[PDB]
Ligand binder design. Structure first.
Ligand SMILES: Cc1cc(N2CC[C@@](C#N)(C3CC3)C2=O)cc(NC(=O)Cc2ccccc2)n1
Ligand code: PRO
Ligand SMILES: [Cl-]
Length: 489
């Protein structure tokens, strides 16, 4: 059985590749930026999909399916894939593969919305989209084709639309923190980073300590009336006056899995939080030749049935052609959070040996105690994974006053929280300056595939105090808010 041999804290990229290949999460493909999602990864996607779909159904959002193609003139009302032929017959007008579906959906919204009684209109779809960039792709985190949901709502007032933006952003916080045990920071995107055409974009941002990079985990946009004006989406009040609708859109992708993998993995391979692990407990029988193997396997089956009564997801690995040691490594690499070992000694004592994946700590638990204690143990693992990741997030953010402090902090692979005047031009200049200083540094390093530019990640909702005369860290103008910056995906 393959072991992960790269160390997470020494060659992070090689570590990540080994962890996702050797655990059978991914397979490569002959078109660049496209990868195969194998069942071990797909199962985790199914779990978060089900969580989020159930939660938005409770909000009255209904699923739908809109075409994957969009006409040139509807899309252009650059990073798009264009279809131009069927067989060898040219199309009269090329058609694009969707990168996002506002321009596919909103002509229909304009047809469907007639009066205030048609609102709010709330739709979602689960599908894949294509964003054909040429920069370095990374499995799960940044790919040419990815799976996502996208929700699109329309409301009679801005207040109700904004309320929904924030309710969805809270569901994305729960997707990452409660399901995947990944801490995130809620905030607003800067004017240069917000969705094209929208009014205000909110985000949850995550952090990869090993390469210092922030990453946008999910996004929820107040489109306001901008798209309603573009698509003539209006409704009548009760006396017949026409008004524009107020819109949101929001989306979360398979990037989430990658974030999870990078957050919790260790030098042995994956560590999957128990709430989304497709196998929570793997039972490994010890099978000597000189034992009553039928009695040991019979007890493993009884324990499996007992655990499944508490809804624990259990597999018995009773393969005779591998040793227990081999199986220990096999399921460690795959990130199963609990292993249960049962041999003749255990049978005789009425106990089982349980080993937790995150710490390696082992417990002896009586069969009667097994189901409640495992449940307690899985909640403790989930909580411990989250708290440890949150401590690394906090340790990864430096509060600074002045631009002179930026390069030392980025050299420590940290994010910076700085007072900023929020001038869009300033962000563009900071990106270019940090980028050129990073190139110099790389040459002093004797070194390289992603950009060294520092950009804004999010103006966090939770704002530290801003003292009276605080200046912006780059311009010296009056600072308006604390903003989180870093290198990023
Ligand atoms: C897997 C994944 C995710 C996401 N993005 C975007 C923001 C967002 C968020 N939040 C979406 C709105 C929901 C997200 O997850 C984007 C992508 N590829 C790309 O940009 C294309 C690409 C390919 C190679 C290199 C550089 C760029 N690939
Ligand atoms: O691509 C985006 O960011 C928005 C949210 C999902 C639909 N379009
Ligand atoms: Cl479905």
């Amino acid at each position: 059985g393959a072991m992960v041999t790269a160390k997470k804290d020494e060659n992070f990229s090689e570590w990540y590749t080994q962890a996702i290949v050797r655990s059978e999460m991914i397979e490569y493909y002959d078109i660049s930026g496209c990868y195969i999602m194998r069942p071990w990864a797909f199962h985790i996607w199914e779990k978060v999909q089900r969580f989020f779909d159930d939660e938005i159904k409770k909000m009255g959002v209904e699923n739908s399916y809109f075409p994957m193609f969009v006409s040139r003139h509807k899309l252009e009302k650059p990073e798009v894939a264009w279809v131009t032929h069927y067989g060898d017959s040219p199309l009269p007008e090329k058609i694009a593969i969707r990168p996002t579906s506002e321009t596919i959906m909103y002509p229909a919204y304009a047809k469907w919305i007639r009066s205030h009684r048609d609102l709010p209109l709330k739709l979602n779809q689960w599908c894949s989209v294509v964003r054909w960039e040429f920069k370095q792709p990374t499995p799960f985190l940044r790919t040419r084709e990815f799976l996502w949901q996208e929700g699109h709502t329309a409301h009679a007032t801005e207040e109700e639309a904004w309320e929904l933006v924030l309710d969805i952003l809270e569901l994305y916080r729960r997707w990452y923190e409660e399901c995947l045990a990944v801490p995130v920071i809620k905030g607003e995107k800067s004017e240069g980073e917000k969705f094209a055409g929208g009014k205000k974009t909110t985000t949850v941002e995550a952090f990869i300590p090993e390469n210092g990079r922030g990453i946008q985990a999910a996004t929820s946009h107040l489109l306001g009336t901008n798209f309603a004006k573009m698509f003539e989406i209006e409704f009548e009040d009760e006396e017949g006056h026409k008004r524009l609708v107020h819109q949101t859109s929001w989306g979360c992708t398979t990037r989430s899995l990658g974030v999870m993998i990078m957050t919790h993995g260790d030098d042995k391979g994956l560590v999957i939080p128990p709430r989304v692990a497709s196998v929570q407990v793997v039972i490994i029988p010890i099978l000597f030749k000189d034992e009553n193997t039928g009695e040991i396997l019979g007890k493993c089956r009884e324990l499996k049935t007992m655990l499944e009564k508490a809804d624990i997801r259990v597999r018995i690995d009773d393969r005779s052609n591998y040793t227990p040691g081999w199986k220990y490594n096999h399921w460690e690499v795959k990130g199963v959070p609990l292993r249960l070992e049962l041999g003749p000694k255990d049978l005789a004592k009425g106990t089982a040996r349980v080993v937790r994946r995150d710490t390696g700590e082992a417990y002896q638990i009586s069969w009667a105690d097994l189901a409640p204690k495992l449940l307690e143990l899985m909640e403790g693992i989930q909580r411990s994974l989250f708290e440890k990741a949150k401590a690394r997030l906090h340790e990864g953010i430096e509060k600074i006053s002045t631009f002179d402090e930026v390069m030392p902090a980025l050299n420590r692979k940290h994010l910076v929280l700085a007072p900023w005047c929020e001038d869009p031009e300033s962000e563009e200049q900071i990106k270019k300056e940090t980028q050129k200083l990073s190139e110099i540094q790389a040459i002093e390093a004797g070194d390289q595939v992603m950009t060294g530019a520092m950009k804004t990640l999010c103006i966090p909702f939770d704002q530290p105090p801003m003292p009276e005369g605080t200046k912006c860290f780059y311009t010296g103008k009056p600072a308006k808010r604390w903003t989180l910056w870093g290198r990023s995906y």
